[PDB]
Design a binder for this molecule. Structure first.
Ligand SMILES: C=C1/C(=C\C=C2/CCC[C@]3(C)[C@@H]([C@H](C)CCCC(C)(C)O)CC[C@@H]23)C[C@@H](O)C[C@@H]1O
Lengths: 240, 11
């Protein structure tokens, strides 16, 4: 059964997401304008988008039960490694299979494969990124499962640089068991079939997507002129 | 370890 504590946990993560994801996308107006003409013409805009989203991912992680019990250092390593993965995850909410783009409310802020390409990335990342978005969308997760997956992604024991892996793992196990139990008690079949295992597989896909993004990011950022168009937070979090 | 902005956003 879903204990009171597990329901409390789901309640907290739902609210935390509510406070950190604005479905109206009103803030996108603050970003440098998107240019769709020109090499890297979408980099300033998507760099801003990402920087804004890292800030939101951080606010979410702070409200993850137990996350605050970690040392400043472990909090930092967990966010540095998970940030891009949680951004790929959370972006599923704006992704649409209708035309395989991320649709943020208006044509200006609708992003497709060629936009991401004009941000300095290649199909080696972009294709499997879309396949990821598609397969995640096909799980048709409950919002409860969506926020649990993001939280589990953030508190992962095997992230590089982790110190207190025993405690990271203990916090994750609490969220994992919350998710496994939620699915059994609240996700009716056939949608529930192997759903936990499919969700964990998506966390593996995310590791692979993380690895490739980092590679294309290092190539992009190694050019001082490109790294110039990024933001200070992106340079600190993604590396410089 | 030299993450001023991450650390500030986490506090
Ligand atoms: C951010 C969010 C959104 C979409 C995410 C996208 C679409 C454009 C391309 C992005 C930003 C992918 C790129 C591979 C990342 C490039 C970043 C950089 C150039 C710095 O290496 C990752 C996720 C993709 C919109 C909204 O869902 C909020 C969410 O929070």
């Amino acid at each position: 059964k879903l204990s009171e504590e597990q329901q409390h946990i789901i309640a907290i993560l739902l609210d935390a997401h509510h406070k950190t994801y604005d479905p109206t996308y009103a803030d996108f107006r603050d970003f440098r304008p998107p240019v769709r003409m020109s090499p890297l013409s979408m980099l300033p805009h998507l760099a801003d988008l990402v920087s804004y989203s890292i800030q939101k991912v951080i606010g979410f992680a702070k409200m993850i039960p137990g996350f605050r019990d970690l040392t400043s250092d472990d909090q930092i390593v967990l966010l540095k490694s998970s940030a891009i993965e949680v951004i790929m995850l959370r972006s599923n909410q704006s992704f649409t299979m209708d035309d395989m783009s991320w649709d943020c409310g208006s044509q200006d802020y609708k992003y497709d494969v060629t936009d991401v390409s004009k941000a300095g990335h290649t199909l080696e990342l972009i294709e499997p990124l879309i396949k990821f978005q598609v397969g995640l969308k096909k799980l048709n997760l409950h919002e409860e499962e969506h926020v649990l997956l993001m939280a589990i992604c953030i508190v992962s024991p095997d992230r590089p640089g982790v110190q207190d892996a025993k405690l990271v793992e203990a916090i994750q196990d609490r969220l994992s068991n919350t998710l496994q139990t939620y699915i059994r008690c609240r996700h009716p079949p056939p949608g529930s079939h192997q759903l936990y295992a499919k969700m964990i597989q998506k966390l593996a896909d995310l590791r692979s997507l993380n690895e490739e993004h980092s590679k294309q990011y290092r190539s992009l950022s190694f050019q001082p002129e490109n790294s110039m168009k990024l933001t200070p937070l992106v340079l600190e979090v993604f590396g410089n | 370890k030299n993450h001023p902005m991450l650390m500030n956003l986490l506090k």
